[PDB]
Coordinates of C-alpha atoms in Angstrom, one line a residue:
Chain P
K3 CA -4.2 5.9 16.2
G4 CA -0.3 6.8 16.5
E5 CA 0.9 5.2 20.4
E6 CA -2.0 4.1 20.6
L7 CA -1.2 0.9 18.0
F8 CA 1.9 -0.2 19.9
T9 CA 0.1 -0.7 23.4
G10 CA 1.9 -4.7 22.9
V11 CA 3.6 -7.0 20.5
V12 CA 3.0 -6.1 16.8
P13 CA 4.2 -8.4 14.2
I14 CA 6.7 -7.2 11.4
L15 CA 7.4 -7.7 8.3
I16 CA 10.6 -6.3 6.4
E17 CA 11.7 -6.5 2.2
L18 CA 15.0 -4.5 1.4
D19 CA 15.6 -4.7 -2.7
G20 CA 19.4 -3.8 -3.1
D21 CA 22.0 -3.1 -5.1
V22 CA 25.5 -3.1 -4.5
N23 CA 28.3 -2.1 -7.0
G24 CA 26.1 -4.6 -9.5
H25 CA 25.4 -7.1 -7.0
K26 CA 21.9 -7.4 -6.3
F27 CA 19.9 -9.0 -4.0
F28 CA 16.5 -9.4 -1.5
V29 CA 16.5 -9.6 2.3
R30 CA 13.0 -10.9 4.0
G31 CA 12.6 -10.6 7.8
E32 CA 8.9 -11.5 10.2
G33 CA 9.5 -11.6 13.3
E34 CA 8.0 -8.6 16.0
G35 CA 8.2 -5.4 18.3
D36 CA 6.8 -4.4 21.6
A37 CA 7.6 -1.1 22.1
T38 CA 6.7 -0.5 25.9
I39 CA 10.0 -2.3 26.0
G40 CA 11.5 -1.0 23.0
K41 CA 12.7 -4.5 21.7
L42 CA 13.0 -6.3 18.3
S43 CA 12.7 -10.4 17.7
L44 CA 14.0 -10.7 13.9
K45 CA 15.3 -13.2 12.1
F46 CA 16.2 -12.1 8.1
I47 CA 16.6 -14.3 5.5
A48 CA 19.0 -13.1 2.1
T49 CA 16.1 -15.0 -0.7
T50 CA 18.7 -14.9 -3.1
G51 CA 21.6 -17.0 -1.6
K52 CA 24.6 -15.2 -0.6
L53 CA 24.2 -11.6 0.6
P54 CA 27.3 -9.7 -1.1
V55 CA 27.7 -7.7 1.5
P56 CA 28.0 -8.5 5.7
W57 CA 24.7 -8.3 7.5
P58 CA 26.2 -5.9 9.7
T59 CA 25.9 -3.6 7.1
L60 CA 22.9 -3.8 6.5
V61 CA 21.5 -3.9 10.6
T62 CA 20.9 0.1 10.2
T63 CA 18.3 0.2 7.1
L64 CA 17.1 -2.8 8.1
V66 CA 11.7 0.6 12.5
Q67 CA 12.1 2.9 15.3
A68 CA 8.3 3.3 15.6
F69 CA 9.3 0.6 17.8
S70 CA 11.5 2.3 20.5
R71 CA 10.9 3.1 24.5
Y72 CA 10.1 6.9 24.8
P73 CA 9.5 7.1 28.6
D74 CA 6.6 8.5 30.0
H75 CA 8.3 12.0 30.7
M76 CA 10.0 11.8 26.6
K77 CA 6.0 10.5 24.7
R78 CA 5.4 13.9 23.3
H79 CA 9.1 13.9 21.6
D80 CA 8.4 9.9 19.0
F81 CA 7.8 11.4 15.7
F82 CA 8.0 7.7 14.6
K83 CA 4.2 6.6 16.4
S84 CA 2.6 10.2 15.7
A85 CA 2.8 9.1 12.3
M86 CA 0.8 6.1 12.5
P87 CA -1.0 4.1 11.2
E88 CA -0.2 5.7 7.7
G89 CA 3.4 6.1 8.2
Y90 CA 6.6 7.9 7.3
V91 CA 9.3 7.6 4.2
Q92 CA 12.8 7.7 6.3
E93 CA 15.5 8.0 3.9
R94 CA 19.2 7.7 4.6
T95 CA 22.9 8.3 3.1
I96 CA 25.6 6.5 4.2
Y97 CA 29.3 7.0 4.2
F98 CA 31.4 4.4 4.9
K99 CA 34.9 5.8 5.6
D100 CA 37.3 5.2 3.1
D101 CA 35.0 3.0 0.8
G102 CA 31.7 3.5 -0.1
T103 CA 28.3 4.8 -0.1
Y104 CA 24.9 3.4 0.3
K105 CA 21.1 5.3 0.0
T106 CA 18.1 4.3 0.9
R107 CA 14.6 4.6 0.8
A108 CA 12.0 3.1 2.7
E109 CA 8.4 3.0 3.4
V110 CA 7.6 2.3 7.3
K111 CA 4.2 2.0 7.3
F112 CA 1.0 -0.2 9.0
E113 CA -0.9 -3.0 6.2
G114 CA -3.4 -4.5 8.4
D115 CA -2.0 -5.6 12.0
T116 CA 1.8 -5.4 10.9
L117 CA 3.9 -3.3 11.0
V118 CA 5.9 -3.3 7.2
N119 CA 9.5 -1.8 6.3
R120 CA 10.0 -1.6 2.6
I121 CA 13.5 -0.3 1.5
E122 CA 14.8 0.2 -1.7
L123 CA 19.0 0.5 -1.1
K124 CA 21.6 1.6 -3.9
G125 CA 25.0 1.0 -3.3
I126 CA 28.4 2.1 -5.0
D127 CA 31.9 3.0 -5.1
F128 CA 32.6 0.1 -2.7
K129 CA 37.2 -1.1 -2.8
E130 CA 36.4 -5.1 -4.6
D131 CA 39.6 -5.5 -0.6
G132 CA 38.2 -2.8 1.1
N133 CA 36.0 -3.7 4.8
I134 CA 32.6 -4.0 3.4
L135 CA 33.2 -6.5 -0.6
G136 CA 36.2 -7.9 1.1
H137 CA 34.0 -9.5 4.5
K138 CA 36.3 -8.4 7.1
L139 CA 33.3 -7.2 9.3
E140 CA 32.9 -8.9 12.8
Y141 CA 29.0 -10.6 13.1
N142 CA 28.2 -8.4 16.0
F143 CA 27.1 -4.6 16.6
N144 CA 28.3 -1.8 18.8
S145 CA 26.2 0.6 21.1
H146 CA 25.1 3.8 19.5
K147 CA 23.4 7.5 19.7
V148 CA 21.2 8.7 17.3
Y149 CA 20.4 12.6 17.2
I150 CA 17.5 13.7 16.1
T151 CA 16.0 16.9 15.7
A152 CA 13.4 18.8 14.0
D153 CA 12.6 19.8 10.6
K154 CA 9.8 21.9 10.5
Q155 CA 10.3 23.1 7.4
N156 CA 8.9 19.8 5.8
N157 CA 7.3 18.1 8.9
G158 CA 9.6 15.1 9.9
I159 CA 12.6 15.2 11.6
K160 CA 16.0 14.1 10.7
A161 CA 18.9 12.1 12.6
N162 CA 22.8 12.8 12.2
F163 CA 25.1 9.3 13.9
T164 CA 27.6 7.3 13.2
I165 CA 28.2 3.5 13.1
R166 CA 30.9 1.5 14.0
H167 CA 31.8 -1.8 12.6
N168 CA 34.1 -4.1 14.4
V169 CA 36.8 -5.1 12.5
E170 CA 38.1 -8.7 12.3
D171 CA 41.9 -7.5 12.9
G172 CA 40.6 -5.5 15.6
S173 CA 40.2 -1.8 13.8
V174 CA 36.9 0.3 13.2
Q175 CA 35.3 0.4 10.8
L176 CA 33.0 3.5 10.3
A177 CA 29.9 4.4 8.9
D178 CA 28.0 7.8 8.7
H179 CA 24.5 8.3 8.6
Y180 CA 22.4 11.1 7.3
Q181 CA 18.9 10.2 7.6
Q182 CA 15.2 12.6 7.1
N183 CA 11.9 11.1 7.6
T184 CA 8.9 12.5 6.6
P185 CA 4.7 11.7 7.2
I186 CA 3.4 9.9 4.4
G187 CA 0.2 10.9 5.4
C188 CA -2.2 13.8 7.0
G189 CA -2.8 14.0 10.2
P190 CA -1.0 15.9 12.6
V191 CA 2.7 14.9 14.1
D192 CA 5.2 15.1 17.5
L193 CA 7.7 17.4 15.9
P194 CA 10.5 16.8 18.9
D195 CA 12.9 18.4 21.0
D196 CA 16.8 17.4 20.2
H197 CA 17.2 14.1 21.8
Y198 CA 18.8 11.0 21.4
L199 CA 17.9 6.5 21.0
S200 CA 20.6 4.8 22.5
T201 CA 20.9 1.5 20.8
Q202 CA 21.6 -2.4 21.4
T203 CA 21.9 -5.2 19.1
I204 CA 22.8 -8.5 19.3
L205 CA 23.4 -11.2 16.3
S206 CA 22.5 -14.2 16.3
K207 CA 22.3 -17.1 13.9
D208 CA 19.2 -20.4 13.4
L209 CA 21.8 -23.3 13.8
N210 CA 18.5 -24.6 11.6
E211 CA 19.0 -22.7 8.5
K212 CA 21.1 -23.3 5.7
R213 CA 20.0 -20.1 3.9
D214 CA 22.3 -17.3 4.2
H215 CA 20.1 -14.9 7.0
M216 CA 19.9 -13.3 10.3
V217 CA 18.1 -13.2 13.6
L218 CA 18.2 -10.1 15.8
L219 CA 18.1 -8.9 19.0
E220 CA 17.7 -5.4 20.0
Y221 CA 16.5 -3.2 22.9
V222 CA 16.6 0.6 21.9
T223 CA 15.2 3.4 24.8
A224 CA 15.3 7.4 24.0
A225 CA 16.7 9.7 26.0
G226 CA 18.6 13.6 26.2
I227 CA 15.7 15.0 27.2
Chain V
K3 CA -12.3 21.8 -8.9
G4 CA -14.6 19.0 -7.6
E5 CA -17.7 18.0 -8.9
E6 CA -16.5 20.9 -11.9
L7 CA -14.2 18.5 -13.7
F8 CA -17.4 15.9 -14.5
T9 CA -20.0 19.2 -16.3
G10 CA -19.5 17.6 -19.5
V11 CA -18.3 13.8 -21.5
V12 CA -14.5 12.8 -19.8
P13 CA -13.0 10.2 -21.2
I14 CA -11.6 7.3 -19.4
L15 CA -8.9 4.9 -20.0
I16 CA -9.0 1.9 -17.1
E17 CA -6.0 -0.8 -17.0
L18 CA -6.0 -4.4 -14.8
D19 CA -2.9 -6.1 -14.0
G20 CA -4.4 -9.6 -12.8
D21 CA -3.9 -13.3 -11.2
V22 CA -5.9 -15.5 -11.1
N23 CA -4.6 -19.3 -9.3
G24 CA -1.8 -18.5 -11.2
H25 CA -3.1 -16.9 -14.4
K26 CA -2.0 -13.9 -15.8
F27 CA -3.9 -11.8 -16.7
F28 CA -4.4 -7.7 -18.6
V29 CA -6.9 -5.7 -19.7
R30 CA -7.4 -2.1 -21.2
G31 CA -10.6 -0.3 -21.5
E32 CA -11.1 3.4 -22.7
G33 CA -14.2 5.1 -23.6
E34 CA -16.5 8.0 -21.9
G35 CA -18.1 9.3 -18.4
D36 CA -20.8 11.8 -18.6
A37 CA -21.5 11.8 -14.5
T38 CA -25.0 14.5 -15.2
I39 CA -27.0 11.5 -16.4
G40 CA -24.9 8.7 -15.2
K41 CA -23.6 6.8 -17.8
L42 CA -20.7 4.8 -18.6
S43 CA -19.9 4.1 -22.3
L44 CA -16.3 1.6 -22.9
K45 CA -14.7 -1.2 -24.5
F46 CA -12.4 -4.1 -22.1
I47 CA -9.7 -5.6 -24.6
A48 CA -7.6 -8.8 -22.9
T49 CA -3.9 -8.3 -24.1
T50 CA -3.7 -11.9 -22.6
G51 CA -5.3 -14.0 -24.6
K52 CA -8.8 -15.2 -23.5
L53 CA -9.4 -14.2 -19.4
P54 CA -8.9 -17.5 -17.0
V55 CA -12.4 -15.9 -15.8
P56 CA -16.1 -14.7 -17.0
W57 CA -16.4 -11.3 -18.3
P58 CA -18.8 -10.5 -15.8
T59 CA -16.8 -10.8 -13.0
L60 CA -14.8 -8.3 -13.5
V61 CA -17.5 -5.1 -13.9
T62 CA -17.1 -4.4 -10.2
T63 CA -13.4 -3.7 -10.3
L64 CA -13.3 -2.5 -13.3
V66 CA -14.9 4.5 -11.8
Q67 CA -17.9 5.1 -9.3
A68 CA -17.0 9.4 -9.9
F69 CA -19.3 8.8 -13.0
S70 CA -22.4 7.9 -10.7
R71 CA -25.2 10.4 -11.4
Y72 CA -25.7 12.5 -7.7
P73 CA -28.4 14.4 -7.9
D74 CA -29.0 17.6 -7.0
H75 CA -30.3 17.1 -3.8
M76 CA -27.5 15.0 -2.4
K77 CA -24.8 16.5 -4.3
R78 CA -22.8 16.9 -0.6
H79 CA -23.3 13.0 -0.5
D80 CA -20.8 12.8 -3.4
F81 CA -17.1 11.7 -2.1
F82 CA -15.8 10.2 -5.3
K83 CA -15.5 13.3 -7.2
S84 CA -14.8 15.6 -3.9
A85 CA -11.0 13.7 -4.4
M86 CA -10.8 15.0 -7.7
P87 CA -8.5 14.8 -9.9
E88 CA -5.9 14.4 -7.3
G89 CA -7.9 10.8 -7.1
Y90 CA -9.1 7.6 -4.4
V91 CA -7.8 4.7 -3.5
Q92 CA -10.4 2.1 -4.0
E93 CA -9.5 -1.3 -2.2
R94 CA -12.1 -4.6 -2.1
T95 CA -12.5 -8.1 -1.0
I96 CA -14.7 -10.2 -3.6
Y97 CA -16.6 -13.6 -1.7
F98 CA -18.2 -15.9 -4.7
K99 CA -20.0 -18.0 -3.0
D100 CA -18.8 -21.4 -2.5
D101 CA -15.4 -20.4 -4.4
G102 CA -12.7 -18.2 -4.3
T103 CA -12.1 -14.7 -3.6
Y104 CA -11.3 -10.9 -4.8
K105 CA -7.9 -8.5 -3.5
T106 CA -8.1 -5.2 -5.4
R107 CA -6.3 -2.2 -5.0
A108 CA -7.3 1.2 -7.2
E109 CA -5.3 4.3 -8.1
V110 CA -8.5 6.3 -9.5
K111 CA -7.5 9.9 -10.8
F112 CA -6.9 12.5 -13.1
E113 CA -4.4 12.4 -15.7
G114 CA -4.5 15.0 -17.9
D115 CA -7.9 15.6 -18.6
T116 CA -8.3 11.8 -18.9
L117 CA -10.0 9.8 -15.9
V118 CA -6.9 7.0 -15.3
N119 CA -8.5 3.7 -13.6
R120 CA -5.4 1.7 -13.0
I121 CA -6.6 -1.6 -10.8
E122 CA -4.0 -4.6 -9.7
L123 CA -6.8 -7.7 -8.7
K124 CA -5.3 -11.1 -6.6
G125 CA -7.6 -13.7 -6.7
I126 CA -7.1 -17.0 -5.0
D127 CA -8.9 -20.5 -3.8
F128 CA -10.8 -21.0 -7.1
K129 CA -12.4 -23.8 -8.1
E130 CA -11.6 -25.8 -11.2
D131 CA -14.7 -26.0 -11.9
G132 CA -16.7 -23.9 -9.8
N133 CA -19.1 -21.7 -11.9
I134 CA -16.2 -18.6 -12.6
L135 CA -12.8 -21.2 -13.1
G136 CA -15.5 -23.1 -15.8
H137 CA -17.0 -20.4 -17.0
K138 CA -20.8 -21.2 -16.2
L139 CA -21.8 -17.4 -15.8
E140 CA -24.0 -16.1 -18.3
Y141 CA -22.9 -12.6 -20.2
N142 CA -25.0 -10.3 -18.2
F143 CA -25.2 -8.2 -15.0
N144 CA -27.6 -7.5 -12.8
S145 CA -29.2 -4.4 -11.3
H146 CA -27.8 -3.5 -7.6
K147 CA -27.2 -1.1 -4.7
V148 CA -24.3 -0.3 -3.4
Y149 CA -24.5 0.9 -0.2
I150 CA -22.5 3.2 0.9
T151 CA -21.3 5.0 4.1
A152 CA -18.8 7.6 6.3
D153 CA -15.6 6.1 6.9
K154 CA -14.9 9.2 9.3
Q155 CA -11.2 7.8 11.0
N156 CA -10.1 7.1 7.3
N157 CA -10.8 10.4 5.7
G158 CA -13.2 8.2 3.1
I159 CA -15.8 5.3 3.2
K160 CA -16.8 2.3 3.4
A161 CA -19.3 0.3 0.9
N162 CA -21.3 -3.1 1.2
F163 CA -23.0 -4.6 -1.2
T164 CA -23.7 -8.2 -3.2
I165 CA -23.8 -9.2 -6.2
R166 CA -25.8 -11.0 -8.4
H167 CA -24.1 -13.3 -11.2
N168 CA -26.7 -15.0 -13.5
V169 CA -25.6 -18.8 -13.7
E170 CA -26.4 -20.9 -17.0
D171 CA -28.6 -22.8 -15.6
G172 CA -30.7 -20.4 -13.7
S173 CA -29.1 -20.3 -10.6
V174 CA -27.6 -17.5 -9.0
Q175 CA -23.7 -17.3 -8.2
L176 CA -23.7 -13.9 -5.0
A177 CA -20.5 -12.6 -4.5
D178 CA -20.0 -9.9 -1.4
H179 CA -18.3 -7.1 -1.9
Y180 CA -16.3 -5.2 1.0
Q181 CA -15.3 -1.7 -0.4
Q182 CA -13.1 1.0 1.7
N183 CA -11.6 4.5 -0.5
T184 CA -9.7 7.1 0.9
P185 CA -8.4 9.9 -0.6
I186 CA -4.5 10.7 -2.5
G187 CA -4.6 14.3 -1.2
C188 CA -4.7 15.9 1.5
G189 CA -7.2 18.0 1.2
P190 CA -10.9 18.0 2.8
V191 CA -13.2 15.3 0.7
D192 CA -17.2 15.1 1.3
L193 CA -18.5 12.8 4.0
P194 CA -21.6 11.3 3.3
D195 CA -24.6 10.6 4.8
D196 CA -25.6 7.0 4.3
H197 CA -26.9 6.3 0.8
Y198 CA -27.1 3.6 -1.9
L199 CA -26.0 3.9 -5.5
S200 CA -28.6 2.0 -7.9
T201 CA -26.9 0.0 -10.4
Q202 CA -28.2 -1.0 -14.1
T203 CA -25.8 -2.6 -16.8
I204 CA -25.9 -3.9 -20.1
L205 CA -22.6 -6.0 -21.7
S206 CA -22.5 -6.5 -25.3
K207 CA -19.4 -7.8 -28.1
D208 CA -18.4 -5.6 -31.3
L209 CA -18.6 -7.4 -33.8
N210 CA -15.0 -6.2 -35.5
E211 CA -13.5 -6.8 -32.6
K212 CA -10.6 -10.2 -33.1
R213 CA -9.9 -10.3 -29.8
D214 CA -11.0 -11.3 -26.8
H215 CA -13.6 -7.9 -25.1
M216 CA -15.7 -7.0 -23.3
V217 CA -19.0 -3.0 -24.1
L218 CA -19.9 -2.6 -21.7
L219 CA -22.9 0.2 -20.7
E220 CA -24.0 1.2 -17.2
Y221 CA -26.6 3.8 -15.9
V222 CA -25.6 4.6 -12.2
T223 CA -28.0 6.8 -9.6
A224 CA -27.5 7.7 -5.9
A225 CA -30.4 7.4 -3.7
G226 CA -31.9 6.9 -0.5
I227 CA -31.6 10.9 0.5
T228 CA -35.3 12.3 1.1
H229 CA -35.4 15.5 -1.3
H230 CA -35.1 19.0 -0.1
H231 CA -35.5 22.2 -1.7
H232 CA -32.1 23.7 -0.1
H233 CA -30.3 20.5 -0.6
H234 CA -29.9 19.7 3.3

């Protein structure tokens, strides 16, 4: 059904199995997305206890199918076109002057729920760096996610740099290299070059004692 | 290769990873299938000791590619057409007045062997019901497995009700809801409505000390009128 699966509010489940410098953890998120307005509303729990990395470093890894593509750009939405069978999303994330994340996720419908299941491996992080030292502010900047077609692989590639505010007023950069490929065998919409423009708020549930992240996000496509 | 993979006798491996009301168990079966006559000959062993559920309730979960499709119905054999890459088979099984099984299996060739790997989760069973209370006879009835095309998923659906004999002369019903989808991305046979008609005998191997089941099964497709040009 592709884009037809996103005409209303869709329940979301996200699971991340993580290992950073040997620190293993598991994050589960639940909530809902509404692609007609480009909005996500999610709560994440670290079920394994205190997260060994800052929550903001996990935001990009933790469902671009919920981006709002305006009417004139609907035919450049690879993400929805791959549904319900879904797509594989792979990243390498280079934290400047620090370690790297490598991720692999499957994003697909399981029944009426959109599910993002992720494995993340992090290596070479510095003990007193901004990441293991938890020096990053609990907030998130606006970015442009640049998307281009990958015809040879019937999918897309994306490139962008995330800017993490540091507590001392500096910025921690994280270069993202991304590849998406369809899981199913029905055709997809290999887009012209464009980008997603993102906005994100991070907050807390004041009644939640577990280590957790409430996230609100709005994303719209542009550049065509 | 498809149908061509089933012209002779084919070795089978079956593995079931199970959990029913918290009872973990594991079953491995080996044997062979002969699709030209629709015959399975298999022996199953539990590696986890005595099963928490009766052997007969696991029979349908434990390779419909070995069904005999008569020559005039060969164009309706979805199961063999997905081979060797294989198919995913998913069911929900509702035991009347009792619990439910949910199963996901991949059926495919691994080398020369047809392999069925299954995950089973059972929930909401009654402690002294026919299943957890082991009140089902060690036998198996004849059924019609009703198959229909699922064009939107390039696969099939099946509906049927299994009748388990209970030791007091009553019957324990289990409503099966089934979906199959190809693993590969190549064309498959999508059938007209038809059914599989089944017969099964359950026995023991007198030399086997583990909890186990020997199974012999004959299945033949039917419900489509004979035509000389196999239309």
